[PDB]
Amino acid sequence: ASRLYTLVLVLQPQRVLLGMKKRGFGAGRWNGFGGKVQEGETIEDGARRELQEESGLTVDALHKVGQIVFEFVGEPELMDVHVFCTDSIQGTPVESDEMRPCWFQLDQIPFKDMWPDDSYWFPLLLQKKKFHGYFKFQGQDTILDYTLREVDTV
Ligand SMILES: Cc1cc(OCCCO)nc(N)n1
Protein backbone atom coordinates (compact mmCIF):
# COMPACT_ATOMS: atom_id res chain seq x y z
CA ALA A 1 0.00 0.00 0.00
CA SER A 2 2.72 2.53 -0.96
CA ARG A 3 2.79 5.54 -3.38
CA LEU A 4 5.99 6.78 -5.06
CA TYR A 5 7.30 10.26 -4.36
CA THR A 6 10.55 12.06 -5.17
CA LEU A 7 12.44 14.66 -3.11
CA VAL A 8 15.40 16.66 -4.53
CA LEU A 9 17.92 18.60 -2.46
CA VAL A 10 20.01 21.13 -4.37
CA LEU A 11 23.12 20.87 -2.18
CA GLN A 12 26.19 22.93 -2.94
CA PRO A 13 29.46 23.00 -0.83
CA GLN A 14 28.34 25.87 1.48
CA ARG A 15 24.55 26.02 0.98
CA VAL A 16 21.29 24.18 0.28
CA LEU A 17 18.20 25.42 -1.57
CA LEU A 18 14.81 24.90 0.18
CA GLY A 19 11.34 25.99 -0.84
CA MET A 20 8.66 27.35 1.47
CA LYS A 21 5.35 25.75 0.40
CA LYS A 22 2.33 28.09 0.22
CA ARG A 23 -0.51 25.45 0.21
CA GLY A 24 -1.23 21.71 0.19
CA PHE A 25 1.02 18.95 1.66
CA GLY A 26 3.86 20.51 3.66
CA ALA A 27 2.41 24.09 3.56
CA GLY A 28 4.20 26.53 5.85
CA ARG A 29 7.37 24.39 5.94
CA TRP A 30 10.72 24.62 4.10
CA ASN A 31 11.06 21.49 1.97
CA GLY A 32 13.16 20.03 -0.87
CA PHE A 33 11.46 19.83 -4.29
CA GLY A 34 9.35 16.87 -5.25
CA GLY A 35 6.07 15.06 -5.62
CA LYS A 36 4.26 12.10 -7.12
CA VAL A 37 5.84 10.00 -9.90
CA GLN A 38 3.63 9.71 -13.01
CA GLU A 39 2.47 6.65 -14.97
CA GLY A 40 5.20 5.49 -17.42
CA GLU A 41 7.77 7.84 -15.83
CA THR A 42 10.98 6.62 -14.09
CA ILE A 43 11.59 7.80 -10.50
CA GLU A 44 14.66 9.82 -11.70
CA ASP A 45 12.67 11.53 -14.51
CA GLY A 46 9.95 12.34 -11.96
CA ALA A 47 12.59 13.91 -9.67
CA ARG A 48 14.00 16.04 -12.56
CA ARG A 49 10.44 17.09 -13.61
CA GLU A 50 9.42 18.07 -10.01
CA LEU A 51 12.61 20.07 -9.45
CA GLN A 52 11.80 22.18 -12.61
CA GLU A 53 8.05 22.56 -11.89
CA GLU A 54 8.61 23.63 -8.29
CA SER A 55 11.92 25.58 -8.37
CA GLY A 56 12.42 26.54 -12.06
CA LEU A 57 15.87 24.89 -12.03
CA THR A 58 17.20 22.47 -14.63
CA VAL A 59 19.14 19.53 -13.11
CA ASP A 60 21.94 17.90 -15.09
CA ALA A 61 23.35 15.14 -12.84
CA LEU A 62 21.06 13.66 -10.07
CA HIS A 63 22.40 11.30 -7.40
CA LYS A 64 20.20 8.89 -5.43
CA VAL A 65 20.90 9.50 -1.70
CA GLY A 66 18.07 7.86 0.20
CA GLN A 67 14.73 6.11 0.48
CA ILE A 68 12.32 7.03 3.28
CA VAL A 69 8.91 5.51 3.91
CA PHE A 70 6.42 7.73 5.75
CA GLU A 71 3.41 6.44 7.56
CA PHE A 72 0.63 8.73 8.92
CA VAL A 73 -1.40 6.73 11.46
CA GLY A 74 -4.98 6.31 10.20
CA GLU A 75 -3.92 7.04 6.57
CA PRO A 76 -3.80 3.86 4.41
CA GLU A 77 -1.22 5.05 1.88
CA LEU A 78 2.46 4.92 2.82
CA MET A 79 4.69 7.53 1.11
CA ASP A 80 7.69 5.84 -0.50
CA VAL A 81 10.04 8.82 -0.91
CA HIS A 82 13.08 8.49 -3.15
CA VAL A 83 15.58 11.17 -2.11
CA PHE A 84 18.02 12.73 -4.57
CA CYS A 85 20.86 15.23 -4.39
CA THR A 86 22.51 17.54 -6.97
CA ASP A 87 25.23 20.22 -7.03
CA SER A 88 25.01 20.68 -10.90
CA ILE A 89 22.03 22.89 -11.82
CA GLN A 90 21.14 25.53 -14.46
CA GLY A 91 18.95 28.61 -14.07
CA THR A 92 17.95 30.70 -11.05
CA PRO A 93 15.25 29.56 -8.54
CA VAL A 94 11.84 30.99 -9.49
CA GLU A 95 9.38 32.16 -6.79
CA SER A 96 5.86 31.18 -7.76
CA ASP A 97 2.50 31.46 -6.06
CA GLU A 98 3.07 27.82 -4.89
CA MET A 99 6.70 27.99 -3.70
CA ARG A 100 9.13 30.54 -2.19
CA PRO A 101 12.77 29.30 -2.69
CA CYS A 102 15.69 30.43 -0.51
CA TRP A 103 19.36 29.43 -0.14
CA PHE A 104 20.43 28.44 3.40
CA GLN A 105 24.00 28.25 4.73
CA LEU A 106 24.67 24.72 6.06
CA ASP A 107 24.96 25.96 9.72
CA GLN A 108 21.61 27.80 9.29
CA ILE A 109 19.23 24.99 8.06
CA PRO A 110 15.74 25.93 9.49
CA PHE A 111 14.94 22.61 11.20
CA LYS A 112 12.24 24.13 13.46
CA ASP A 113 10.33 25.20 10.28
CA MET A 114 10.83 21.92 8.38
CA TRP A 115 9.22 18.47 8.61
CA PRO A 116 10.43 16.96 11.98
CA ASP A 117 12.01 13.91 10.24
CA ASP A 118 14.51 16.19 8.43
CA SER A 119 16.50 16.79 11.71
CA TYR A 120 17.25 12.99 11.64
CA TRP A 121 18.46 12.38 8.02
CA PHE A 122 19.71 15.82 6.88
CA PRO A 123 22.94 15.33 9.02
CA LEU A 124 23.59 12.16 6.92
CA LEU A 125 22.76 13.97 3.69
CA LEU A 126 25.27 16.75 4.61
CA GLN A 127 28.04 14.21 5.23
CA LYS A 128 27.47 12.52 1.79
CA LYS A 129 25.96 9.38 3.37
CA LYS A 130 23.18 7.27 1.83
CA PHE A 131 20.27 6.01 3.94
CA HIS A 132 17.08 3.98 4.33
CA GLY A 133 14.50 5.37 6.70
CA TYR A 134 10.97 4.82 7.98
CA PHE A 135 9.01 7.38 10.06
CA LYS A 136 5.63 6.80 11.76
CA PHE A 137 3.77 10.09 12.29
CA GLN A 138 0.66 10.95 14.30
CA GLY A 139 -0.57 14.10 12.59
CA GLN A 140 2.03 16.34 11.00
CA ASP A 141 4.18 17.22 14.01
CA THR A 142 4.75 14.08 16.05
CA ILE A 143 7.09 11.20 15.26
CA LEU A 144 5.81 8.14 17.17
CA ASP A 145 8.80 5.96 16.10
CA TYR A 146 11.30 5.58 13.30
CA THR A 147 14.20 3.59 11.91
CA LEU A 148 17.15 5.10 10.05
CA ARG A 149 20.16 3.17 8.73
CA GLU A 150 23.13 4.12 6.52
CA VAL A 151 23.43 2.05 3.36
CA ASP A 152 25.99 1.53 0.54
CA THR A 153 23.22 1.29 -2.09
CA VAL A 154 19.93 3.10 -2.04
C1 LIG B 1 6.79 13.48 6.54
C2 LIG B 1 7.54 13.98 5.35
C3 LIG B 1 7.07 13.79 4.06
C4 LIG B 1 7.84 14.29 3.03
O1 LIG B 1 7.35 14.09 1.78
C5 LIG B 1 8.11 14.59 0.67
C6 LIG B 1 7.44 14.07 -0.58
C7 LIG B 1 7.83 14.89 -1.75
O2 LIG B 1 6.86 15.91 -1.83
N1 LIG B 1 8.99 14.94 3.22
C8 LIG B 1 9.38 15.06 4.51
N2 LIG B 1 10.53 15.69 4.74
N3 LIG B 1 8.70 14.61 5.58
From Swiss-Prot:
PTM per Swiss-Prot/TrEMBL: The N-terminus is blocked.
UniProt-listed GO biological process terms: DNA protection; DNA repair; purine nucleoside catabolic process; response to oxidative stress
Binding site for Mg(2+) 1: G34, E54, E98
Effect of W115A: Greatly reduces or abolishes 2-oxo-dATPase and 8-oxo-dGTPase activities
Binding site for N(6)-methyl-AMP: T6, K21, W115, P116, D117, D118
Reported impact of G34R: Reduces activity by 97%
Annotated residues for binding of 2-oxo-dATP: T6, N31, F33, G34, G35, K36, W115, P116, D117, D118
Keywords: Cytoplasm, Hydrolase, Magnesium, Metal-binding, Mitochondrion, Nucleus, RNA-binding, Transit peptide
Tissues expressing this chain: Widely expressed with highest expression in thymus, testis, embryo and proliferating blood lymphocytes.
Quaternary structure, from the entry: Monomer.
Family membership noted in the UniProt record: Belongs to the Nudix hydrolase family.
Inhibition and activation profile: Inhibited by 2-oxo-dADP and 8-oxo-dGDP.
Alphabetical list of SUPFAM superfamilies matching this protein: Nudix
The protein's name: Oxidized purine nucleoside triphosphate hydrolase
pH-activity profile: Optimum pH is 7.8-8.2 with 8-oxo-dGTP as substrate, and 8.0-8.5 with 2-oxo-dATP as substrate.
Effect annotated for changing D152A: Enhances 2-oxo-dATPase and 8-oxo-dGTPase activities and increases thermolability
Motif (Nudix box): 35-56
Binding-site residues for Mg(2+) 2, renumbered to this chain: E50, E53
